Structure formats: C-alpha cells, structure tokens
C-alpha cells in the first residue's frame, strides 16, 4: 500500500536520520517506502538473516567486512555503466572490488584523527610520548589529557601499527593471508605504551566509545581519537575543537586504518533494481550526500563533485592527512579473524589479564588461523523463537568438485535425522549459486513448540571430507499468554 519498500541497515554511529531524509525524497518521487534501521551487531547478524526475509535490501559498513560477505555469496554484483562509474573516485571502487567483481557502492573515505579542545589545549601534542606529562598537568587542574574507545581495536590500531604492526602483508598485488604482523617488535612497543598509559592511570581500561564521547563533549578531557561521524555531536556541545594529525610514536606517524563506507545489496533481495536506483540516483548525488553529511559527517565522499565542494573543510583535510599516513583496510575474508583476535589482545593486555607478549603472540596465531577442513563458510548459530513462531537456520558451504556436491544432514539430538521429520512443521531447503560457487542449506522450523527446543547438529560431507557443528534452539512462551 506504498508501491513497495526498501530496508536499509547502517551502523548507529552514522547519519541514519539524514539517510532517512533521502529515503523520504525517494518515497515521495517513487511511492517506495524506505526504512533505515541500525541494529546492534548488524555486521555479525547479516549473514544469518540475509536469505530469510528478515534481511535488509541494503547493508552499509566499511569495506573490510564485504570480502567475507562476498565469499559467502551474500552480495549482489554491481555492474555499473561507465557514466555512473566515472562519477566516483577509482580509489573508492577499488575498495569494493573482490576477486574481479564490484560487490558494493562506495560512499565515503574515513580515517581517525586527533580531536582536541582548544580551550584546554591550544597546542596539541605532536608525540604520544608527551601525553603522560600533559595528563599530569591537566590532572592538577581536574581534567585529563586523552580519552578514547579502548574496547574496539580500530581505535588503538594506529598506535600499534606506528612502529611496525600490520594486519596482512601485501606484495605482488595481493594480501598474503598467512603473513600477519601482530606480534612483532613494533606492535609490542605500541601496545606496551598503551598498557603503560593505563597502568599510570593516564587512561582507564574500561573506557568505551560512549564514555570517551561524553567526556570530550562535556569538556572533561582535552583530547579524543575519533572519526568524521563524531564531529556533529561535538558541534552541539560547548566545545571549541580542532581536528589534527595523530601523534607520532617513536618518531613514526600513527597509522590509522582507512575505511571506505560502502553500501552492499543483498543478493537475496527481490528489490535489487530499486536498491540500485536509490543508491545511484538519490544517495550518491550532491543533495543526497549533503543530507547524510549534515547529520553525521561522512569524511571524503566518493562522489567527485561533492568531495570537491567539501575539500576546503580543514577537518576533512586532517582526515585525509591521517589516512595517507595509514593503510587501507584489506577486504579479505580473513579480516574478521584478524579483528576478533586483536580485540581480544588489546582488552586482555589493557586490563592486566595477560601480558602484552602473551596477548600478541596468541593474537598472531589466531589472526592467521584457518578452518582446518574447509567446508563451512557460514555455520548455523543458536536461535530463539516464540511458541507458534518460525525460524530458519542456515549453513553455507564452499563448492569444490563440480560433479559431486556437498551434502548436508540436519539432526535434533544425537540421532534424529530431520529429513525424516519434514512435514507440516519442518522444511528443508537447498540451493546453489554458481556465481559465488556457494551451496546454501536451510532448515525451517514452523509453528515452534516447547518440544522443538534444544540441541541440533548440521553435518556436511563430500566424498573425502566431513565437518559438523552444533547449535541450540530456545523456545519462548508468547507474551500475553501469561497472565
Ligand atoms: O572488535 C570486534 C569487531 O571487529 C570488527 O569490526 C571492525 C570493523 O569491521 C571496521 O570497519 C572498523 O569499524 C569501525 C568503522 O569502520 C567506523 O566507521 C566506525 O563505526 O567505528 C568502527 C569501530 O568501532 O573496526 C572494527 C574493529 O574495531 C567486525 O567486523 C565486528 O563484527 C566486531 O565486533
């Protein structure tokens, strides 16, 4: 009763209200309603929901996540005409290329900068090493020098990488997925410096994104480390801030990762054409990007015409100076393993639960680890459902032999093979996508009952290999059934 609908997911720190404004212009022109959501952990949830119908038509994230999604067949291939391709910077298209395919529309280039309060700190430090002394000075005055998010490795990486840390080695035109730079002398020096800041009480291991933002925006701390999306909240506050180059460490620049905010289209969306129309004709226009940017700044936008108009913004200039000193994020599937490993290391080293050496050595091994067997690309995860509701569990498997596909069997408990229970309340659905060479296997549980709850198993086999995983279903009583 709208003409149609598009569902968009974007992270909660981005300009979702501006994006909804572009959506309202789309609706008015087109009759198609646009809903912009920003669920928690959307980037982890997307693979599970992509092909169920609870998936978004469009997903926004930095480009690093998208190679993994593409390996799993989750993203529609983008094949633009030259006319449109030429409107965006080739650099931004490069970020969304995976094994010869464009897998998203690039939106904007982001990097972290040093953001400082000019009334507490007219001249911000040039080196990380000066920060302890600055903080002693500010503490005597009831403030602190620096607060930033210590829970996400994105924010600590620039210091870790400064003297020699790296994610994956790049050479002869490709990333070496096995060659990781997490436990070298450089990374250890950077993480040790961070840990010592915390030991010396210049920072607190528990500081997260909200805490640091509140502290900076209320004038409690002289500096923070953040990206373009944060500037508009600071504008609302009383703070006179600058945006500048990150401090050096051991004489070397901090090396922030460069992220390209990108918009991928769900391969399972029935609305791919509408999604492209929205993205090309509404969002990636001067007027569209202005709406989003005015909500939460995007950085250096991919659209040449508008990037040129904003380039005079000194905040954007500083963003790009930091970006030039840093490294572009890889988009390889292994980046997930890298990020999870480094997150663990920083949190454990910062809190004192592990030594820096132990944290980084473990993270080095974990970031490079492979799936031993190499069948599952995506495993079904624990689920919850209300009594009478429906739930879909999914597995994705990498195809290999053309002649002998992988075969999946689903079980409840030790031995009940669910193909023997297909009926009114259970379905099994298989498909293959030759574009991605990915097999999708689904188990559908409908009219869920208390008895449906418990442990299940998904077994995948080929002529010579086998793997299996377990997952749990929790069945909740409906609200209003009691009392
Ligand atoms: O820490 C665990 C975490 O690792 C992974 O997230 C990384 C992102 O994929 C990556 O893009 C980057 O995220 C930052 C955005 O680019 C930026 O625009 C912004 O919103 O801040 C984000 C950092 O909070 O960095 C992280 C790691 O910090 C992964 O894909 C997640 O599932 C995950 O929970």
Short mmCIF file of C-alpha atoms and ligand atoms in Angstrom, two decimals:
data_model
loop_
_atom_site.label_atom_id
_atom_site.label_comp_id
_atom_site.label_asym_id
_atom_site.label_seq_id
_atom_site.Cartn_x
_atom_site.Cartn_y
_atom_site.Cartn_z
CA UNK A 1 0.00 0.00 0.00
CA UNK A 2 3.06 2.03 -0.65
CA UNK A 3 4.12 0.79 -4.08
CA UNK A 4 6.99 -1.04 -2.42
CA UNK A 5 9.53 -0.98 0.42
CA UNK A 6 13.34 -0.90 0.86
CA UNK A 7 15.02 -1.84 4.16
CA UNK A 8 18.44 -0.41 4.94
CA UNK A 9 20.88 -1.28 7.73
CA UNK A 10 23.59 1.14 8.76
CA UNK A 11 25.66 1.45 11.92
CA UNK A 12 24.31 3.51 14.79
CA UNK A 13 27.17 5.98 14.68
CA UNK A 14 26.42 7.10 11.11
CA UNK A 15 23.89 9.57 9.68
CA UNK A 16 20.78 7.38 9.77
CA UNK A 17 18.46 10.38 10.08
CA UNK A 18 19.99 12.11 7.06
CA UNK A 19 19.79 8.78 5.20
CA UNK A 20 16.11 8.53 6.16
CA UNK A 21 15.63 12.04 4.66
CA UNK A 22 17.00 10.82 1.32
CA UNK A 23 14.62 7.90 1.76
CA UNK A 24 11.66 10.26 2.21
CA UNK A 25 12.56 12.05 -1.06
CA UNK A 26 12.74 8.59 -2.71
CA UNK A 27 9.30 7.72 -1.32
CA UNK A 28 7.76 10.99 -2.49
CA UNK A 29 9.11 10.59 -6.03
CA UNK A 30 8.63 6.87 -6.23
CA UNK A 31 5.98 5.69 -3.74
CA UNK A 32 8.55 3.26 -2.32
CA UNK A 33 8.93 3.45 1.46
CA UNK A 34 12.50 3.43 2.84
CA UNK A 35 13.14 2.20 6.37
CA UNK A 36 16.58 2.74 7.87
CA UNK A 37 17.48 0.52 10.83
CA UNK A 38 20.68 0.32 12.84
CA UNK A 39 20.61 -2.89 14.84
CA UNK A 40 23.35 -3.72 17.31
CA UNK A 41 25.99 -6.02 15.83
CA UNK A 42 24.30 -5.74 12.40
CA UNK A 43 27.51 -6.84 10.68
CA UNK A 44 27.51 -10.09 12.66
CA UNK A 45 23.77 -10.63 12.21
CA UNK A 46 23.61 -10.01 8.47
CA UNK A 47 24.92 -13.37 7.25
CA UNK A 48 22.38 -15.30 9.37
CA UNK A 49 19.47 -13.26 8.16
CA UNK A 50 20.48 -12.38 4.61
CA UNK A 51 18.38 -15.00 2.79
CA UNK A 52 15.46 -15.40 5.23
CA UNK A 53 13.33 -12.33 4.54
CA UNK A 54 14.36 -10.66 7.77
CA UNK A 55 17.39 -9.42 5.83
CA UNK A 56 17.87 -5.82 4.70
CA UNK A 57 17.92 -4.94 0.99
CA UNK A 58 20.97 -2.75 1.56
CA UNK A 59 23.70 -3.04 4.16
CA UNK A 60 26.16 -0.25 4.97
CA UNK A 61 29.54 -0.94 6.55
CA UNK A 62 33.18 -0.14 5.99
CA UNK A 63 34.53 -2.15 3.07
CA UNK A 64 36.62 -4.52 5.23
CA UNK A 65 33.59 -6.72 6.02
CA UNK A 66 32.49 -7.10 2.45
CA UNK A 67 35.01 -9.64 1.09
CA UNK A 68 33.80 -12.13 3.68
CA UNK A 69 30.16 -11.48 2.76
CA UNK A 70 31.03 -11.87 -0.92
CA UNK A 71 32.88 -15.17 -0.30
CA UNK A 72 29.64 -16.43 1.25
CA UNK A 73 27.57 -15.26 -1.74
CA UNK A 74 25.65 -12.70 0.28
CA UNK A 75 26.11 -9.66 -2.01
CA UNK A 76 24.75 -8.79 -5.42
CA UNK A 77 27.37 -7.99 -8.04
CA UNK A 78 27.39 -4.38 -9.04
CA UNK A 79 27.90 -3.78 -12.75
CA UNK A 80 27.52 -0.04 -13.31
CA UNK A 81 27.57 1.80 -16.65
CA UNK A 82 30.62 3.88 -17.40
CA UNK A 83 28.61 7.06 -16.97
CA UNK A 84 27.96 6.30 -13.32
CA UNK A 85 31.28 4.63 -12.56
CA UNK A 86 33.07 7.79 -13.62
CA UNK A 87 31.25 9.89 -11.02
CA UNK A 88 33.07 8.21 -8.09
CA UNK A 89 36.80 8.10 -7.34
CA UNK A 90 38.51 4.99 -8.71
CA UNK A 91 40.13 4.56 -5.28
CA UNK A 92 36.71 4.10 -3.74
CA UNK A 93 35.66 1.49 -6.32
CA UNK A 94 38.92 -0.38 -5.66
CA UNK A 95 37.93 -0.77 -2.04
CA UNK A 96 34.76 -2.59 -3.08
CA UNK A 97 36.34 -4.95 -5.57
CA UNK A 98 36.54 -8.58 -4.57
CA UNK A 99 38.14 -11.16 -6.90
CA UNK A 100 37.23 -9.28 -10.06
CA UNK A 101 33.74 -8.19 -9.00
CA UNK A 102 32.40 -4.94 -7.64
CA UNK A 103 30.39 -6.01 -4.57
CA UNK A 104 29.06 -2.65 -3.28
CA UNK A 105 28.69 1.05 -3.98
CA UNK A 106 31.40 3.12 -2.25
CA UNK A 107 30.11 6.10 -0.23
CA UNK A 108 32.96 7.82 1.61
CA UNK A 109 36.54 7.56 2.89
CA UNK A 110 37.04 7.61 6.71
CA UNK A 111 40.12 7.73 8.95
CA UNK A 112 40.64 8.53 12.59
CA UNK A 113 42.13 11.84 13.67
CA UNK A 114 43.17 13.57 16.89
CA UNK A 115 40.39 15.80 18.09
CA UNK A 116 41.35 18.37 20.73
CA UNK A 117 39.69 21.02 22.86
CA UNK A 118 41.35 24.33 22.01
CA UNK A 119 40.38 25.93 25.35
CA UNK A 120 42.08 23.19 27.41
CA UNK A 121 44.89 22.60 24.99
CA UNK A 122 45.76 25.32 22.48
CA UNK A 123 48.65 23.32 21.08
CA UNK A 124 48.03 19.63 20.97
CA UNK A 125 50.93 17.22 21.33
CA UNK A 126 52.89 16.03 18.39
CA UNK A 127 54.08 12.83 20.08
CA UNK A 128 52.44 10.07 22.05
CA UNK A 129 55.41 10.22 24.45
CA UNK A 130 54.45 13.75 25.63
CA UNK A 131 51.00 12.68 26.70
CA UNK A 132 51.83 11.34 30.20
CA UNK A 133 53.31 14.70 31.20
CA UNK A 134 50.37 16.61 29.69
CA UNK A 135 47.99 14.48 31.66
CA UNK A 136 49.81 15.13 34.90
CA UNK A 137 49.43 18.85 34.13
CA UNK A 138 45.74 18.58 33.34
CA UNK A 139 45.03 16.29 36.33
CA UNK A 140 46.31 19.03 38.64
CA UNK A 141 43.58 21.09 37.12
CA UNK A 142 40.87 18.47 37.46
CA UNK A 143 40.83 17.30 33.81
CA UNK A 144 42.59 14.58 31.81
CA UNK A 145 44.58 14.68 28.59
CA UNK A 146 43.10 11.93 26.49
CA UNK A 147 40.12 9.57 26.40
CA UNK A 148 39.13 7.30 23.53
CA UNK A 149 37.45 3.97 22.95
CA UNK A 150 39.68 1.18 24.26
CA UNK A 151 37.20 -1.63 23.58
CA UNK A 152 37.43 -1.64 19.79
CA UNK A 153 40.78 -2.37 18.19
CA UNK A 154 40.08 0.12 15.40
CA UNK A 155 40.92 2.93 17.80
CA UNK A 156 44.14 1.51 19.28
CA UNK A 157 45.47 0.16 15.98
CA UNK A 158 47.03 3.47 14.85
CA UNK A 159 49.44 3.37 17.83
CA UNK A 160 50.10 -0.38 17.49
CA UNK A 161 50.91 -0.05 13.78
CA UNK A 162 53.03 3.12 14.14
CA UNK A 163 56.39 1.40 14.82
CA UNK A 164 55.75 -1.73 12.74
CA UNK A 165 52.49 -3.56 13.42
CA UNK A 166 50.47 -4.67 10.38
CA UNK A 167 47.46 -6.87 9.60
CA UNK A 168 48.29 -8.74 6.43
CA UNK A 169 51.41 -8.45 4.27
CA UNK A 170 50.77 -7.05 0.81
CA UNK A 171 53.02 -7.91 -2.09
CA UNK A 172 52.90 -8.69 -5.81
CA UNK A 173 49.37 -7.27 -5.98
CA UNK A 174 47.75 -9.30 -3.23
CA UNK A 175 47.48 -9.81 0.51
CA UNK A 176 49.27 -12.75 1.98
CA UNK A 177 46.51 -14.23 4.15
CA UNK A 178 49.02 -16.19 6.22
CA UNK A 179 51.51 -13.38 6.96
CA UNK A 180 50.33 -11.36 9.94
CA UNK A 181 52.09 -8.53 11.76
CA UNK A 182 50.51 -8.57 15.21
CA UNK A 183 53.37 -9.98 17.34
CA UNK A 184 56.37 -8.05 16.03
CA UNK A 185 58.58 -5.67 17.94
CA UNK A 186 56.69 -2.64 16.60
CA UNK A 187 53.25 -3.84 17.65
CA UNK A 188 54.58 -4.83 21.05
CA UNK A 189 56.08 -1.36 21.61
CA UNK A 190 52.81 0.32 20.71
CA UNK A 191 50.64 -1.93 22.83
CA UNK A 192 53.12 -1.64 25.70
CA UNK A 193 52.91 2.16 25.52
CA UNK A 194 49.11 1.95 25.71
CA UNK A 195 49.21 -0.51 28.61
CA UNK A 196 51.62 1.75 30.47
CA UNK A 197 49.34 4.75 29.98
CA UNK A 198 46.67 2.75 31.70
CA UNK A 199 48.97 1.45 34.45
CA UNK A 200 49.98 5.07 35.13
CA UNK A 201 46.30 5.98 35.32
CA UNK A 202 46.50 8.37 32.36
CA UNK A 203 43.71 6.21 30.92
CA UNK A 204 41.25 3.57 32.14
CA UNK A 205 40.92 0.16 30.52
CA UNK A 206 37.12 0.26 30.80
CA UNK A 207 36.75 3.38 28.67
CA UNK A 208 34.43 2.77 25.73
CA UNK A 209 33.02 4.83 22.90
CA UNK A 210 30.16 6.43 24.84
CA UNK A 211 32.27 7.23 27.86
CA UNK A 212 35.01 8.94 25.82
CA UNK A 213 32.49 10.89 23.70
CA UNK A 214 30.66 12.15 26.79
CA UNK A 215 33.91 13.13 28.45
CA UNK A 216 35.16 15.07 25.45
CA UNK A 217 31.85 16.69 24.60
CA UNK A 218 31.42 17.84 28.20
CA UNK A 219 34.91 19.35 28.41
CA UNK A 220 36.31 16.85 30.90
CA UNK A 221 39.17 15.62 28.71
CA UNK A 222 41.43 17.67 26.41
CA UNK A 223 41.64 15.15 23.51
CA UNK A 224 39.93 12.20 21.95
CA UNK A 225 40.51 9.98 18.90
CA UNK A 226 37.60 9.60 16.56
CA UNK A 227 36.38 9.84 13.01
CA UNK A 228 34.28 12.28 10.97
CA UNK A 229 30.93 10.83 12.18
CA UNK A 230 31.62 12.23 15.64
CA UNK A 231 32.03 15.91 14.70
CA UNK A 232 28.35 16.92 14.63
CA UNK A 233 27.75 15.77 18.26
CA UNK A 234 30.70 17.91 19.31
CA UNK A 235 29.17 20.82 17.35
CA UNK A 236 26.05 20.58 19.59
CA UNK A 237 28.17 20.87 22.70
CA UNK A 238 30.04 23.90 24.04
CA UNK A 239 33.46 22.70 22.82
CA UNK A 240 35.84 24.67 20.60
CA UNK A 241 37.61 21.76 18.93
CA UNK A 242 40.23 21.13 16.30
CA UNK A 243 40.90 18.05 14.19
CA UNK A 244 44.57 17.33 13.53
CA UNK A 245 47.26 14.80 12.76
CA UNK A 246 47.61 11.90 15.15
CA UNK A 247 50.65 11.98 17.43
CA UNK A 248 53.80 10.13 16.35
CA UNK A 249 55.26 7.21 18.23
CA UNK A 250 58.98 6.56 18.19
CA UNK A 251 59.15 9.31 15.55
CA UNK A 252 56.82 7.42 13.23
CA UNK A 253 53.36 8.53 12.32
CA UNK A 254 50.36 6.79 13.83
CA UNK A 255 48.86 4.61 11.07
CA UNK A 256 45.09 4.54 11.19
CA UNK A 257 43.22 2.09 9.01
CA UNK A 258 41.43 3.63 6.07
CA UNK A 259 37.80 2.60 5.71
CA UNK A 260 35.51 3.17 2.77
CA UNK A 261 31.91 3.28 3.95
CA UNK A 262 30.15 1.12 1.38
CA UNK A 263 26.58 0.05 0.52
CA UNK A 264 26.12 -3.59 -0.44
CA UNK A 265 22.95 -5.02 -1.94
CA UNK A 266 21.58 -8.27 -0.53
CA UNK A 267 21.90 -11.00 -3.17
CA UNK A 268 18.61 -12.41 -1.92
CA UNK A 269 16.74 -9.11 -2.18
CA UNK A 270 13.78 -9.09 -4.57
CA UNK A 271 14.43 -5.36 -4.88
CA UNK A 272 17.93 -5.17 -6.34
CA UNK A 273 16.95 -2.83 -9.15
CA UNK A 274 15.16 -0.43 -6.79
CA UNK A 275 18.17 -0.54 -4.45
CA UNK A 276 20.47 0.49 -7.28
CA UNK A 277 18.07 3.29 -8.30
CA UNK A 278 18.07 4.56 -4.70
CA UNK A 279 21.84 4.42 -4.35
CA UNK A 280 22.78 5.90 -7.76
CA UNK A 281 20.04 8.46 -8.24
CA UNK A 282 19.29 9.54 -4.68
CA UNK A 283 22.08 8.83 -2.23
CA UNK A 284 25.16 9.29 -4.41
CA UNK A 285 24.16 12.78 -5.50
CA UNK A 286 25.32 16.13 -4.15
CA UNK A 287 21.95 16.61 -2.48
CA UNK A 288 21.85 13.09 -1.07
CA UNK A 289 25.33 13.12 0.44
CA UNK A 290 24.69 16.60 1.83
CA UNK A 291 21.65 15.29 3.73
CA UNK A 292 23.66 12.46 5.27
CA UNK A 293 26.75 14.62 5.90
CA UNK A 294 24.80 17.30 7.70
CA UNK A 295 23.52 14.62 10.06
CA UNK A 296 26.89 12.93 10.73
CA UNK A 297 29.85 13.85 8.58
CA UNK A 298 30.97 11.17 6.14
CA UNK A 299 34.59 12.15 5.59
CA UNK A 300 35.84 12.43 1.99
CA UNK A 301 32.88 11.38 -0.08
CA UNK A 302 33.31 9.06 -3.06
CA UNK A 303 31.29 11.35 -5.33
CA UNK A 304 33.84 13.57 -7.05
CA UNK A 305 31.59 16.59 -7.44
CA UNK A 306 30.66 16.83 -3.75
CA UNK A 307 34.10 15.80 -2.49
CA UNK A 308 35.43 18.83 -4.34
CA UNK A 309 32.89 21.11 -2.67
CA UNK A 310 33.77 20.00 0.85
CA UNK A 311 37.55 19.59 0.39
CA UNK A 312 38.24 23.02 1.86
CA UNK A 313 36.99 21.79 5.27
CA UNK A 314 40.13 21.64 7.42
CA UNK A 315 38.62 18.67 9.35
CA UNK A 316 38.46 16.74 6.12
CA UNK A 317 41.96 17.79 5.18
CA UNK A 318 43.24 16.44 8.53
CA UNK A 319 41.21 13.24 8.00
CA UNK A 320 42.99 12.70 4.68
CA UNK A 321 46.44 13.55 6.05
CA UNK A 322 45.91 10.83 8.67
CA UNK A 323 44.56 8.47 6.02
CA UNK A 324 47.64 8.98 3.83
CA UNK A 325 49.92 8.02 6.73
CA UNK A 326 47.84 4.93 7.45
CA UNK A 327 46.86 1.84 5.48
CA UNK A 328 43.77 0.85 3.58
CA UNK A 329 41.94 -1.98 5.30
CA UNK A 330 42.17 -5.26 3.48
CA UNK A 331 38.76 -6.62 2.43
CA UNK A 332 39.77 -10.28 2.53
CA UNK A 333 37.55 -12.74 4.42
CA UNK A 334 40.37 -13.28 6.96
CA UNK A 335 39.89 -9.74 8.29
CA UNK A 336 37.16 -10.95 10.63
CA UNK A 337 39.63 -13.37 12.30
CA UNK A 338 42.20 -10.56 12.50
CA UNK A 339 39.80 -8.11 14.13
CA UNK A 340 38.48 -10.58 16.69
CA UNK A 341 41.98 -11.68 17.59
CA UNK A 342 43.27 -8.12 18.03
CA UNK A 343 40.19 -7.08 20.00
CA UNK A 344 40.89 -9.85 22.47
CA UNK A 345 44.58 -8.98 22.74
CA UNK A 346 44.05 -5.32 23.48
CA UNK A 347 41.31 -5.89 26.03
CA UNK A 348 43.33 -8.57 27.83
CA UNK A 349 46.59 -6.62 27.80
CA UNK A 350 44.87 -3.36 28.86
CA UNK A 351 43.06 -4.93 31.79
CA UNK A 352 46.15 -6.77 33.03
CA UNK A 353 44.70 -10.22 32.46
CA UNK A 354 47.55 -11.13 30.15
CA UNK A 355 50.98 -9.77 29.45
CA UNK A 356 51.47 -7.86 26.23
CA UNK A 357 53.77 -10.60 24.94
CA UNK A 358 51.18 -13.33 25.66
CA UNK A 359 48.27 -11.32 24.26
CA UNK A 360 50.01 -10.52 20.97
CA UNK A 361 51.56 -13.94 20.48
CA UNK A 362 48.15 -15.56 20.86
CA UNK A 363 46.57 -12.98 18.58
CA UNK A 364 49.23 -13.57 15.90
CA UNK A 365 48.32 -17.25 15.79
CA UNK A 366 44.57 -16.67 15.92
CA UNK A 367 44.53 -14.00 13.22
CA UNK A 368 46.20 -16.34 10.79
CA UNK A 369 44.25 -19.48 11.71
CA UNK A 370 42.40 -21.41 9.04
CA UNK A 371 39.33 -23.53 9.08
CA UNK A 372 41.09 -26.95 9.13
CA UNK A 373 38.53 -28.73 6.93
CA UNK A 374 37.29 -26.00 4.62
CA UNK A 375 33.67 -26.92 4.06
CA UNK A 376 31.66 -24.43 6.12
CA UNK A 377 31.75 -20.78 5.04
CA UNK A 378 28.93 -19.99 7.44
CA UNK A 379 27.64 -22.20 10.30
CA UNK A 380 24.11 -22.04 11.74
CA UNK A 381 24.02 -20.19 15.05
CA UNK A 382 21.92 -20.60 18.19
CA UNK A 383 18.40 -19.29 17.71
CA UNK A 384 15.39 -18.22 19.70
CA UNK A 385 11.76 -18.39 18.65
CA UNK A 386 8.38 -17.81 20.27
CA UNK A 387 5.91 -20.66 20.58
CA UNK A 388 3.97 -20.75 17.31
CA UNK A 389 6.67 -18.76 15.53
CA UNK A 390 9.01 -19.76 12.69
CA UNK A 391 12.78 -19.81 12.50
CA UNK A 392 15.29 -20.58 9.76
CA UNK A 393 18.73 -22.00 10.41
CA UNK A 394 21.29 -21.84 7.60
CA UNK A 395 24.63 -23.21 6.52
CA UNK A 396 26.80 -22.07 3.63
CA UNK A 397 29.36 -24.41 2.14
CA UNK A 398 32.13 -23.77 -0.33
CA UNK A 399 31.62 -25.75 -3.53
CA UNK A 400 34.57 -27.66 -4.97
CA UNK A 401 34.04 -30.69 -7.22
CA UNK A 402 31.62 -29.80 -10.00
CA UNK A 403 30.45 -33.38 -10.20
CA UNK A 404 29.94 -34.25 -6.56
CA UNK A 405 28.26 -31.54 -4.47
CA UNK A 406 28.48 -31.34 -0.69
CA UNK A 407 25.54 -32.95 1.09
CA UNK A 408 24.03 -31.70 4.33
CA UNK A 409 22.08 -33.51 7.01
CA UNK A 410 20.38 -31.89 9.96
CA UNK A 411 19.77 -33.61 13.29
CA UNK A 412 17.99 -32.95 16.55
CA UNK A 413 19.88 -34.53 19.42
CA UNK A 414 22.16 -37.48 18.84
CA UNK A 415 20.40 -39.30 16.01
CA UNK A 416 17.09 -37.85 14.77
CA UNK A 417 17.67 -37.05 11.09
CA UNK A 418 15.27 -34.21 10.36
CA UNK A 419 14.73 -35.19 6.76
CA UNK A 420 12.59 -37.92 8.40
CA UNK A 421 10.52 -35.19 10.08
CA UNK A 422 9.72 -32.94 7.15
CA UNK A 423 6.03 -32.31 7.44
CA UNK A 424 3.65 -29.57 8.30
CA UNK A 425 6.07 -28.03 10.81
CA UNK A 426 9.54 -28.51 9.27
CA UNK A 427 11.05 -27.91 5.86
CA UNK A 428 14.48 -28.41 4.36
CA UNK A 429 15.60 -26.13 1.51
CA UNK A 430 18.81 -26.38 -0.54
CA UNK A 431 20.19 -24.11 -3.28
CA UNK A 432 23.38 -23.41 -5.20
CA UNK A 433 24.64 -20.13 -6.60
CA UNK A 434 27.03 -20.72 -9.46
CA UNK A 435 28.10 -17.03 -9.41
CA UNK A 436 29.65 -17.45 -5.97
CA UNK A 437 30.11 -21.24 -6.06
CA UNK A 438 28.33 -21.37 -2.70
CA UNK A 439 25.84 -24.01 -1.51
CA UNK A 440 23.11 -22.79 0.82
CA UNK A 441 21.30 -25.25 3.08
CA UNK A 442 18.33 -24.21 5.23
CA UNK A 443 16.33 -25.84 7.99
CA UNK A 444 12.91 -24.25 8.61
CA UNK A 445 11.08 -24.84 11.85
CA UNK A 446 7.46 -23.59 11.85
CA UNK A 447 4.71 -23.48 14.50
CA UNK A 448 7.51 -23.88 17.03
CA UNK A 449 6.64 -25.79 20.20
CA UNK A 450 8.33 -26.25 23.56
CA UNK A 451 9.43 -29.68 22.33
CA UNK A 452 11.29 -28.06 19.41
CA UNK A 453 13.82 -26.61 21.84
CA UNK A 454 17.32 -27.94 22.45
CA UNK A 455 20.44 -29.01 20.61
CA UNK A 456 20.71 -29.64 16.91
CA UNK A 457 23.54 -30.58 14.54
CA UNK A 458 24.39 -29.73 10.95
CA UNK A 459 26.62 -32.29 9.15
CA UNK A 460 28.29 -31.57 5.81
CA UNK A 461 30.10 -34.18 3.77
CA UNK A 462 31.83 -34.61 0.46
CA UNK A 463 33.48 -37.71 -0.93
CA UNK A 464 36.55 -37.27 1.29
CA UNK A 465 35.77 -34.68 3.98
CA UNK A 466 33.28 -34.19 6.77
CA UNK A 467 32.53 -31.44 9.24
CA UNK A 468 29.70 -30.74 11.63
CA UNK A 469 28.55 -28.14 14.08
CA UNK A 470 26.09 -27.85 16.91
CA UNK A 471 23.57 -25.15 17.64
CA UNK A 472 20.74 -24.60 20.06
CA UNK A 473 17.09 -23.52 19.73
CA UNK A 474 15.42 -21.71 22.63
CA UNK A 475 11.63 -21.58 22.54
CA UNK A 476 9.97 -18.68 24.43
CA UNK A 477 6.38 -18.54 25.63
CA UNK A 478 4.37 -15.79 23.97
CA UNK A 479 3.86 -12.51 25.83
CA UNK A 480 0.21 -12.17 26.80
CA UNK A 481 -0.19 -15.95 27.02
CA UNK A 482 0.52 -15.33 30.68
CA UNK A 483 -1.00 -13.79 32.53
O1 LIG B 1 36.26 -5.55 17.63
C1 LIG B 1 35.49 -6.60 17.16
C2 LIG B 1 34.93 -6.16 15.86
O2 LIG B 1 35.87 -6.38 14.87
C3 LIG B 1 35.17 -5.98 13.62
O3 LIG B 1 34.89 -4.59 13.41
C4 LIG B 1 35.82 -3.78 12.82
C5 LIG B 1 35.07 -3.16 11.59
O4 LIG B 1 34.67 -4.21 10.65
C6 LIG B 1 35.84 -1.97 10.93
O5 LIG B 1 35.12 -1.43 9.85
C7 LIG B 1 36.11 -0.96 11.99
O6 LIG B 1 34.87 -0.46 12.44
C8 LIG B 1 34.84 0.97 12.62
C9 LIG B 1 34.16 1.66 11.43
O7 LIG B 1 34.90 1.47 10.27
C10 LIG B 1 33.93 3.13 11.69
O8 LIG B 1 33.18 3.73 10.67
C11 LIG B 1 33.20 3.08 13.00
O9 LIG B 1 31.85 2.93 13.03
O10 LIG B 1 33.94 2.65 14.09
C12 LIG B 1 34.11 1.28 13.92
C13 LIG B 1 34.90 0.82 15.09
O11 LIG B 1 34.08 0.69 16.23
O12 LIG B 1 36.84 -1.51 13.07
C14 LIG B 1 36.35 -2.68 13.67
C15 LIG B 1 37.06 -3.11 14.92
O13 LIG B 1 37.17 -2.10 15.86
C16 LIG B 1 33.90 -6.75 12.95
O14 LIG B 1 33.60 -6.68 11.50
C17 LIG B 1 32.84 -6.79 14.09
O15 LIG B 1 31.90 -7.75 13.90
C18 LIG B 1 33.50 -6.82 15.54
O16 LIG B 1 32.54 -6.98 16.65
#
